[model samples]
Target: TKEQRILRYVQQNAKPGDPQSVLEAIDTYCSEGDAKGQIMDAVIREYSPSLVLELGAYCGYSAVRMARLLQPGARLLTMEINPDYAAITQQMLNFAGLQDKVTILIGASQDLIPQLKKKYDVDTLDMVFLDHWKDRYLPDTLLLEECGLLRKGTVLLADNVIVPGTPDFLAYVRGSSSFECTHYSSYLEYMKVVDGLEKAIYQGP
Candidate 1:
């Protein structure tokens, strides 16, 4: 699998507790886009969010990317339905010494979104990175809304909206009165084909 391959590469090539080295190893292994990280990193820096949630932790690549930018006391919570990926992500985050900065949740986004405030004791999410089930994007956004997880000006960044496009999600965010959406068009990760991230700012519901 691509993730296992990346894991092996990072394990062999990345220096322990050094996030930049881990990123470089993965970037080299992918042979192309660390550009997505560039965009994501810029967004993290832009918001300086205290609480961040990333849906999809395929081996914690993005988790490391985002967590590395977090300031003291800031945290990132990532969800992955796959057990193997969750383990791999944990190992990856630990290798980068980012375990303290991120908490990996294993469950479906729908099942977990509602628990964010109660079970997880989260007040409000400052940022959300949607990269898991594309089909669930719209539903989860609504779940986040109904669950009171989002605050005004919260950033909801959805990836792979072009290559593996999420039409309904895109439409809902772009058309809805509650969101202000921006399209940051770019090539797919490590490939020269069309793919992009849809960044929506929650305006409150």
Candidate 2:
């Protein structure tokens, strides 16, 4: 219901094919949105990644956020376990004219992560945004490694590391020799709560 409301609100407010405009419209409607885009804006600009994988696609908010900044011919492969959300996200991406830039998948991360290389022809991920379940964070990191989806300099930007903190995932990355982790301090989306994003660069084993 809320998502439908958001979708309707976005449709009524945002101009077609303009992601920034959609973002601004969502910024007005969703209290729990957008500041993460501020961080991703710089990441996308700096990395200019060709193949980005997102662990979650919550109504395509972050999808549009990252996809809007990608260089031409680059793509964002995003997953949403919920088909309803996946459908909503598709519409959102379509409304933003990002349909060609993002590929939305409906499946569990663990089942899907292992298939990327063969099924999706993912050579390696330039960037990954982990905004899914907290428990899935570390397992997915390991899965990415096992799947060989990460290479040297691959950026892993994880959200909600401070508010609804992922302590296990934090400890793993911070202690691992292969990753250089940085904590970015920021307020939580739509709320004045202490939260942050963790950026981890894979240095390779």
Candidate 3:
């Protein structure tokens, strides 16, 4: 798949030592002129989300895009299981001039989300981007909901929904009365064929 190819390219070429270079490589490979990047830009623009919670911050490519499109005061809290990845992302963020706008949390979502809630007193996140381990998708989401980390009208974006799909999570969202699904049929980077990306927006009673 083209998206997979692009991902491979980014991962392979991303300057592990220089976060800025890694981000540039991503921007060059994945921006609006590019297929995957365009979809990402569209999502961010549509939501104009203030507080974004991202589950996987691999190399910080997505973080850069989110930071670029969000409001001036908007903030993104990205959680990464790897401390090394977190450190690189922080450096990349600083290089992109987004240090204050994005916070890199070096821990698994399950371990760090509670601390975040208590520290920030955040009842609901405006948006959530999930690109983490496929198996944990539903559990993580449920945890967020249970902790009141996602408020009314929160939008959740799940990448690779069709390719590396999460059937249980998708089904739960569809069955739950609180959520409405909007499937964004777009192709992955470097490909012309369409792929399904699920963007589920939740509304409280």
Could you say which candidate leads in lDDT? 1
What's the ranking of the predictions by lDDT, best on top?
1, 2, 3
**Stretches of candidate 2 exceeding 4 Å from the true structure:** 188-192
Q: What digit string (tens of lDDT, one per residue) describes model 1 on residues 25-135?
A: 988888755757888998998889999999999978899999999989999999999999999999999989999999999999989888888898999999999999888
Clashes (backbone N, CA, C under 3 Å), per candidate, total: 0, 0, 0
What residue pairs are clashing in model 1?
none
lDDT of 2 at 40: 86
For lDDT, candidate 2 versus 3, the one ahead is 2
Error of 2 at 69 (Å): 0.6
Evaluated at residue 39, the lDDT of candidate 1 is 81
Candidates' lDDT values, in order? 0.89, 0.89, 0.76
Per-residue lDDT tens digits for candidate 3, residues 1-205, read 4444445565677655444555567667765524455676777888888899999987667787778677788889899998767766676676566787887778788887777768766667999998888787889988888888887888988876774467899898888989988776665555654555678888875
Worst 10 residues of 3 by lDDT: 1-10
User: Model 3, which residues run further than 4 Å from truth?
Assistant: 1-24, 27-33, 188-195
Higher-lDDT candidate among 1 and 3?
Answer: 1
